[PDB]
RNA sequence: GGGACGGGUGAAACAGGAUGAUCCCGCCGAGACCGCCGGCCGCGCAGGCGCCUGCCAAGACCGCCUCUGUCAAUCAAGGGCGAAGGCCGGGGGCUAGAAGGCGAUCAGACACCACCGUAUUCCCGGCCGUAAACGGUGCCGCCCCGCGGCCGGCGCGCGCGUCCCGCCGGCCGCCCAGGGAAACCGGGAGGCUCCGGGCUCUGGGGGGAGUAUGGCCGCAAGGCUGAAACUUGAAGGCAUUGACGGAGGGGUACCACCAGACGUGGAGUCUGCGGCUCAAUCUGACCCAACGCGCGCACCUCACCAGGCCCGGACGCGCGGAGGACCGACAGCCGGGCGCGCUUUCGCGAUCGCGCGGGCGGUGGUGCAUGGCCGCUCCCAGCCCGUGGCGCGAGCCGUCUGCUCCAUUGCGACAACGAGCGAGACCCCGGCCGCGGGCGCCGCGGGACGGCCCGCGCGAGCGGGAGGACGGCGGGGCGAUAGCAGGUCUGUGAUGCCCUCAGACGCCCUGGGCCGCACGCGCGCUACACUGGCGGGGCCAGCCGGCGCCCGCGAGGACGCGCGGAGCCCCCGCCGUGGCCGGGACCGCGGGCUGGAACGCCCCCGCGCACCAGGAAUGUCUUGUAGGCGCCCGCCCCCACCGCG
C-alpha cells in the first residue's frame, strides 16, 4: 500500500546518512543487503526490511536529485566555502 | 396591428379570453413617489431629513489686541415638541392592503402560498401622548498610551501639488496601562474598600400585579399615579464541557445509494415466538442489540402435574441403653408396587436413641447487591502523561479552519517541547521457486518493496504502461479509554442477603407433561415445470475416509477379515402443455431397527391436499463472488428441513 509510518521514515533517515557510500538511488537489491547486514541496523522482520530500503531509494534520489531537509549529508564541504 | 391562449405556483386551481384577450406602438386621465449617485458622508433638541426653480427666517463651527462684566450649572411644579397605528370634521381615490370573500395544503387550516377587496395609506384643521422612542450607558466640568481614517474652518513651508506640518471642532476603528463576574470598555464601564467635584431621577428575592380601589386627563381607545391578602425557594447574568439541530462546510460505507442480480412477504411443511385449553401444558430473552437461541426433550436429562420409599440429622452437652440402642424377614391380605401398612415371632447387635445448640444440601428469589464471561457503543480512530504557557476558575494549548491517507496515515507550520497506547507492525491459511528428508508430502528458507518507465505534485503522494505466480489493505485471529442499572444467581466446591430443611423445594422410584389447537408472525425446506420429469449407461472431488461372503424386492440380518470416495453434468430413449408421467400433504392394509419400554425412525402396495411465479411492504450481494449441486462432523440408544465446515 502507502502506509509509511513513523518508525519507517524515521529510520531509513537515520541508516541514510551514516551510510550514504554504502547505498545507491535506485537500487532494492543493495539497499535490501546493507539493511540486512548487522553493522548498520537489526530489523526483526522481513517485510520490515523492505519497506525501509524502498524508502531509503526514494529518499536517496530524491537527495541526489537536491538537498533534502533533515539529512546531515555532510553537505558542509560544498557549502564551507 | 395580429390571431389563441394568458395569468399564477414548489406543483396546481379560483378570476381573464373569437364581445379579438396576452403581445407591439401612439395618445389621454388621475393620484402617489424621488431611483442608480447614496457613503464606519452630513444636518437637526430629539422624533426625523433626498425632483427643478424662487422666496422667508434660522443655526453650529472657525478667525479676531471687537463689547459687557458673573449675567452661571442642574432641576419638583408648570409649559412646548413628539415615529407608526388610532379618533373627530372636511377633501381626494393610484398603488398596497387590517376586516371580509374565494382557491389550494393539511387529519383539521378559520394560518403560512395564490387571487379579489373595505377602512387606512395622501392633503387641511384639531385630539391622543405612547415605541427594543437603544449607544438597552442622565447633564456640567478636569487629567489621561500609541497608531490610523473621514468632514468643516484657519495658519505655516516648499520644488505649487486640491502636496505635508500643525491648531480647533465633530464622526469613527484598533489598542498598552487600568478596570470588571465575565462578555468587554479604554474620546471610559479608568483616575474608587488607597472607597468624598456639583445637580436630578430610579431600584431593594420571584409571583399576585402594572391587577383592585380612589384621583387627574381624554370624544373614545386609553394614559399618569398606584396597594394588600395570599403564595413560593429559587428566579436571573456572563462564561465552560458535552448532546442535539428540518444549521453551514469537508470526508466515508452494498449491515447506504446509482447500475444490476438473487430473494422474502404468495401456498404445503419443519422449527421458535404470543394467545386458548388443560392436572401440567416448566422457564429466560422483546427494534437494530428477543423469536434452529440458552448444542437432537418416550426413561434420565427436568425444573412442572398425580402418587410413594430413605435419612445419606456431620460434630458438642444432658439423659437412656446390652437384664438388649437401632436395624431385617416367611406365611396371608391391603395395595400400581416394596416388610409401605396390617394378624402373628422369629432374628440382628451399640455401627447408637431422645432433647438442646449446630450443620450438610437445594435447576429455590433477587443479574436493580456482586465476581467472571459475552454483547453493544464500535465493519468505529480515536485516548492520555511530564515540563512549560493562558485563565480567579470549571477549562484551554500541546491534540492543526492547509495538502494527502481506508485510517490522529503522513507532509508542512504553530506557546509549545518531548513521550506513550490504539492503527500499522504481528500470528494462521493460500498461491511461485529452492534445499533437505521421505511409510503418508512435510520441515527450513527466498520472493513484492508504490521497486522500474512515463506524467504531475516543494512534499507526503495521486493516473497510466510494463515485466512478473501474484500489484498496490488476498481471506481470517487479536483487539484501545470510558461506559450500559444490556444478558447470565438454571454452567461450577463463584458468592452476599432472604426461603426450605423429616408428611422436605434434599435424594430415589412409577406414570403424565414440556409436543396439546377456532387464532396473529420470525428464520428455513419443498414446488409451481420442456433452460423439464422418468428409465438406462459413462464419468471426475475436498474437510477426509473400512471392507468381504451369503440371505432378503427392499430396509435390514448371520458369519469373517483389515481395507477404502458423489451429485450437478455428458450420451441414448419415452412423455408432449393436459393441476398431465409437474407436486407429494393426508389416509388404509403390511414388513423391520433402537431400546427395560415406541408415542420414535426406515421400507412396500394403494389414495393422490394446497400450488400457474405471488398486494401494501422488505433483506443480501462485487471473482472462483452470487446462485445452483451434493458431501462430512457436532449434539445423539434411533432421528437433521438446524449449526460449524
Ligand atoms: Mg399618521
Ligand atoms: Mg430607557
Ligand atoms: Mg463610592
Ligand atoms: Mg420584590
Redesign the pocket.
Known amino acids: 500500500?502507502?502506509?509509511?509510518?513513523?518508525?519507517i521514515?524515521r529510520a531509513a533517515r537515520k541508516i541514510v546518512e551514516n551510510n550514504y557510500e554504502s547505498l545507491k538511488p535506485?537500487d532494492?537489491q543493495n539497499n535490501?543487503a546493507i539493511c540486512s547486514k548487522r553493522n548498520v541496523a537489526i530489523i526483526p522482520?522481513?517485510?520490515?526490511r523492505?519497506?525501509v530500503?524502498?524508502?531509503v531509494?526514494?529518499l536517496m534520489?530524491?537527495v541526489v536529485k537536491g538537498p533534502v531537509?533533515?539529512i546531515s549529508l555532510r553537505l558542509q564541504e560544498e557549502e564551507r566555502e
Open positions: 500500500g502507502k502506509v509509511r509510518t513513523k518508525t521514515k535506485k532494492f535490501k522482520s522481513k517485510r520490515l523492505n519497506k530500503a524502498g524508502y531509494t526514494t534520489n530524491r531537509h533533515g
